[model samples]
Target: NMDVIGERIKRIKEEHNSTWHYDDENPYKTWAYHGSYEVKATGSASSMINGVVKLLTKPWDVVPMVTQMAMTDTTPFGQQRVFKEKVDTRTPRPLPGTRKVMEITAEWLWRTLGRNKRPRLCTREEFTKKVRTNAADSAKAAVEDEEFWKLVDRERELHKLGKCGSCVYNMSRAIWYMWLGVRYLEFEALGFLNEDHWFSRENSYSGVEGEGLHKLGYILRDISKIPGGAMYADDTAGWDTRITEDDLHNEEKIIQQMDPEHRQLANAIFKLTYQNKVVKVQRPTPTGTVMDIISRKDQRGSGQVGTYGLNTFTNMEAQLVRQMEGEGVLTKADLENPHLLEKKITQWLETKGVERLKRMAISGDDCVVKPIDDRFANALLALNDMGKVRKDIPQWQPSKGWHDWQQVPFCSHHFHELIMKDGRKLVVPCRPQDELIGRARISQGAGWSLRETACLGKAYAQMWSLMYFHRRDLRLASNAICSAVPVHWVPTSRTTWSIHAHHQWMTTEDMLTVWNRVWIEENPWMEDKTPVTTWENVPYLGKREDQWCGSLIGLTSRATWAQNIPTAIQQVRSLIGNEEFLDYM
Candidate 1:
């Protein structure tokens, strides 16, 4: 199959060989803009184009980034402006197989997300230390675990080096493409996306003779004004998993080439831009060497669907063996994939399970649980003018963590079947029993590794977490995004932190918006039952041993805004060059 595809690509290129074109040479022949519909492209290219366009229809359909850029500066001029500048450090996509994505993804995981300040490799000694301290009382201590601990040390080194970003990165990329896709669509819909940004059209190539296409990279660098666009360009164009010094220097040169007016805003705008650099890390290996891990980024596949020459992908299944052979790949890395599940379908059980749950939740299956036959219950259920079927009875809102995820209102007994108004049985997850765990072990044949098992379980939990969000919201997507990071990189049993757990972006308007939304569902009758009247009276959401839930349901509502005109002038001075600032005066 690859041979067929490759031959078609080669033939197309040869047929459309360009001698001399000023801009966009051989534009109609490359898969960069055009798929096989062009002289040189594949079905996947078309698929990519289709997928991107379709997703762009819903831009807000993405996970709200929990991790924001550090609130370094105080802005009294306008809080909204301050918040905009403090953009989320995380991106919708990750460039994997390189030092940049691997190291940074891990850095975010260990430092920002997980709060692991000084994460060290789990060594034999550390394992022994834990075994003795935690499992020591019992005579039957699980002895020196060379294999398990070795994986830990290897992963820690991976984290320090920042090498593993593919699995997690892939999931994010899937989300990001949608964001960017919709961005352009919305702009185009408003008749502004294309006219202003020349060469932003689909299948339009900005390829130069001696240089690569200016298609995406050029657009992002100049017009998008999004931070870190240069690094994405480097990843998409580079040959290997690393960005060379030459690449960095060249990219810097490219940024400097912006028009005089554009260049004025370039530096400050690209302040937080990811400039490629090497990170020196202390790794505990044979004799424990301190090595400089090169943090470069690389785009995984030539096109949308990654097709390596002879290697297997973690996302791929064994059923693809035929396609692999047809595509001219033969490797034992195939054995490494599919994990302990052994089957391609089973290995991705978590991904599939999440999809099923998401569908169920969206379809209103989370509305009806086992009906309680009591006076209070009857009165509440009767007041269900919403006519919603839910596995979670909203007559009770468990915990306002995120909308719909308040609680899983399923019972262990299947006596009174919980069904939608349409008789669709609500899928209920019973507690994990010993029988199920034992069955998994029996099938695994003692071939289980702690990392793999933990990874699988986390994915499952992540899916459940998403399913809990019966009401449509971005938190569902956030669960997938957050879970992918640890599962692919660290794979711990329980999360040290939630991606949806915290947010300091609360503004007065934002709080009011949420209050309005919650009132419609929770207290359509209770006339703004806000307990606090003043910001000073707003209860702190967190407390010590003397603590409980349900502290002012919409406590985030207390945020208020103040103006800072003087600070605004100073920020402008800092943002602009001295010459530019003086000229304005």
Candidate 2:
């Protein structure tokens, strides 16, 4: 049994380039190289050989061991007991007064706009009649009229409070667009043209649509150019008690001293900040020393020390050191020599309270600890949750780095066969790398960590599952599939379908005909002959999907497309028949 275990360990080492062993003669020590590098039993670098051997040889024995490890609490015992006594006993404090500042700015704007004359009161019908009669000059007059702006402001406030209905909102927007002199074709291009309802066509004025009211700089520029409106353009100069540094510092105190009703109103409008104090538990190495543990250092050189740097210890470390001193595990002389203190700490960790400390370290850096549910565990859980047919995990492929390979799971590597409605089988390999690259372009384009990107693989298993189950339903299948490279699946007839990377949705027959003509007749030039073209330079065959998706996803070469084209053609031939493919060639 020992020989068999040793043989399995040797094979794993050879296969994964692992650097440690468990044989008695070579004895599996917890730390090697005088504690420079802690030996790991699990990870991409080292296989979980010990656990694997135990599970294989003594299946029942490993269950209870695994259960204990999984259920162990990661929190340190002393801190856990202390927190149990004093936990979340009071109400949380309120957040800062940023919203109050915004309200004050809006108040100043309202006051400054109506200082000279009040808003002219008029019915909605009277305003509409005046605009309809003098259509040509009405737009120009509306821009200069303060009454038009007053009505617009009133409509906007009513809309915010959900008091004004859609018709009134549209009317207010239409009036603003007329003042802006926005053209009809511009409205059509923006998808705002509605033949059914006229008011609905005016619905494009919502800050997001046609550059009518969205740009604040445009309003500022227009107002600043007006003779009497320069004061409105400046941010704080015209307002009473112009925003000073002192106002920011005294905001909380000012709010506290306001009228009781005013204070209550402000508090109701602002959000509260809830604070939860978390106790961090340190994860110790097998040697009982924590990684990158911070301690006080002398300001001067190590040998010639004068004044010390800030004498600070992390709360947990400070508590542990005091306990060790009180328990006589560490003496006053041991503190003078850092190396001696570290040795004593390790000795204490190995000897006294071994089981309790092991529980603390294994539980990890939380008040509660649970077994790690990493990428591999997650994939298995997803399969079981979906109730899909389980298969053996795919063998790991050799790569330059483990993370790049680990970003995709073994389940995602399995190629799926799609049985089309037309009785054709198309084999699609799970190209997780390509899909991830495409997603990264549209999402966080740059400066993302590999760890963050690795988490994105969780969706790959779900996407693959959707594709696998919904084979005949291409529309349902396509919903789960997204690529920077445009791959279109066009139906030739109701039942028959073909795949291509063409700019427009076309069948395989049409694509091959175009490619054939480019190769024979238009080898180096088109009909115009103004520009020369090569075999690879077909107009319809260019990377059009890049423009549609974005630059990041489309940022690939013709060389890469050449590699992808073969896979598409291979899949297409299986659908359209080999004889038809031969005729096109």
Candidate 3:
């Protein structure tokens, strides 16, 4: 049965779209002949039903058959009435056969989608030798022979523990940090650490030093000027002096005398310290893990609805003073005296507390029945004896509404407020990811080829060793007999020697100058260009040349699209002279 069904299905498929054979060559039949009993019976039941439904739903289907029959020689009476074939005037005419051929020239093809010019391919041995030479040169230039061997051994040990990848990545990061440290040391040697020259107003190391160092210097100077700051001083006698109220007041006076730029800087730093102190006092004895404390803080309510709940005791006292003044319980002049205001607010809270407690006792359903200690009992008795206790006293509510509470504007400790050129303020938050931006720029300006080579050595040494050690085990399951692949060995050298070689090559400033000169030579079109007077006038070449190079001999540096094109142009202009180096394009 299965075989029969399969044969039927195959036959149906073969019959699909098959032409029907007519008895005559006229290619036309009479209306009766077209739908005759024999033709209708030949179709399946579904097809027959569909044909009937089509005629019933669309009676116009008979028009084509009738028209064909009318055009035939036969008339309605079956008499032979010869007539010319009918033609449709509205039919589209056939197109002319004269075709135009397009000629594709080599120049046009080259201009459109460029053709790849394949260079001569190196043989297996040649490629292996080239890689070996490059690796040796990089390792020799990056680190000394002794230190390179030490890292090679370290890499092998790490490979055994399956931590080779992370080890290489961490070493690359360490090298990057070392490069940064070198720059910092240069900055320090240039007298950046002196109190008078703590923060540089102008760009340092062609802006490679970044805004972070400026802010860091500012913060350090501010801290050193504070009372008891001398505790950190080298002399033991400096620790005798402590922070005092007068010292803080004098510091504020000093800040007020500073210009707007320095004043804002000092204010931001001071506010950051003040916020830290406030947070410390608020959670002095925190007794939970970080996440536990965070969760607890998130779940706790602010006592009032629609509030952030960040207010301190000072805010509450201010609110109380405003309420008392509005209710005619205190005058503005009376509140002027700090001691009197403090006493008055304390007295008001004590009276309110006693009345609220009395009301809570009277409404026993709303009160918790806790065992009272002697101190609390004595306070209640004294309040009762003073004839100030009354259950009829009205419960206090916010002056605006129950939902209304005093709100204080505060700053985040981690974010700093920066003033822009147009006097607009912006909150600058820390972005750890942007560290790479600085690193990339530094690597580009500084000839970090040595450090880069060291990283490459660390990385490849692990990879090549892994493959070499497992080659035999891998060959057991493989059928390929050829074993000509070469394993590259990293050069072993001391790190200090490599660092010394790196520094001896050229300073970043000098390197950048050479880079600019070479870039001008490579791009002659960029020569004899007008200097940019404004940011809008800065020309952006589609490709960038201000990026880091992985190799010293490489012609093309990395391109960062058009990011910071203005800065790039400015730096180039500063290095190569304004008249020599023009717009990037």
Off by over 4 Å in 3: 1-250, 260-265, 275-585
Worst 10 residues of 1 by lDDT: 228-237
- What is the Cα-based lDDT of residue 106 in candidate 1? 24
Q: TM-scores, in order shown? A: 0.17, 0.17, 0.14
All models, RMSD in angstroms: 29.4, 30.9, 41.7
What's model 2's overall lDDT?
0.24
On the 0 to 100 scale, the lDDT of residue 171 in model 3 is 6
Kindly provide the TM-score of model 1 when superposed on the true structure, using C-alpha atoms.
0.17
lDDT of 1 by residue, 277-362 (tens): 11111212232222111122322221211112101111111112212222223223332232312233232332332221111111
In candidate 2, what are the lDDT values of residues 105-169, reduced to their tens digit?
A: 22332232223423221333444453454342446466456665565554334323323211100
Answer with 1 or 3, whichever has the higher TM-score: 1
Which residues of candidate 2, in runs, are more than 4 Å off?
1-265, 268-559, 562-585
lDDT tens per residue, model 3, 287-389: 2111000000011111211111111111122222223344344443442333343444445544542221211111000111111111222222211211112
Report the number of the highest-lDDT candidate: 2
Clashes of each: 15, 1, 10
Q: Rank the candidates by lDDT, best first.
A: 2, 1, 3
Candidate number that wins on lDDT, 1 or 2: 2
